[PDB]
């Protein structure tokens, strides 16, 4: 098949997974991915951008998916996991935001495990 077609099929999968993370709610109906959605405004969180070198938020990922910016799942994985790592690096694995990010990763690995079959069928038309 044609690469842009492939990259669109993938994009659709990446958007579903990423929407699952953004929308993800605990039994308590509160959105765990909320802290991950927007990068703190530079002007009053100058200390953030000193601790994080390669900052990324879910809104940006969500935006780039729609473009076909992610041509492989590794590039996607890399971006999604960087947003989680940056969160733990800044708030601490033990903070309430790390307890959350931790749990969101599990969600991420399940949705990624489940998509894996479709992702292989696409990539393996090369």
Residue numbers in the entry: 2431 to 2556
Which sentences from the paper describe this structure?
Bromodomains (BRDs) are protein interaction modules that specifically recognize ε-N-lysine acetylation motifs, a key event in the reading process of epigenetic marks. The 61 BRDs in the human genome cluster into eight families based on structure/sequence similarity. Despite large sequence variations, all BRD modules share a conserved fold that comprises a left-handed bundle of four α helices (αZ, αA, αB, αC), linked by loop regions of variable length (ZA and BC loops), which line the Kac binding site and determine binding specificity. The four helices form a deep cavity that is extended by the two loop regions (ZA and BC loops), creating a largely hydrophobic Kac binding pocket.
BRDs are evolutionarily conserved and present in diverse nuclear proteins comprising HATs (GCN5, PCAF), ATP-dependent chromatin-remodeling complexes (BAZ1B), helicases (SMARCA), methyltransferases (MLL, ASH1L), transcriptional coactivators (TRIM/TIF1, TAFs) transcriptional mediators (TAF1), nuclear-scaffolding proteins (PB1), and the BET family (Muller et al., 2011).
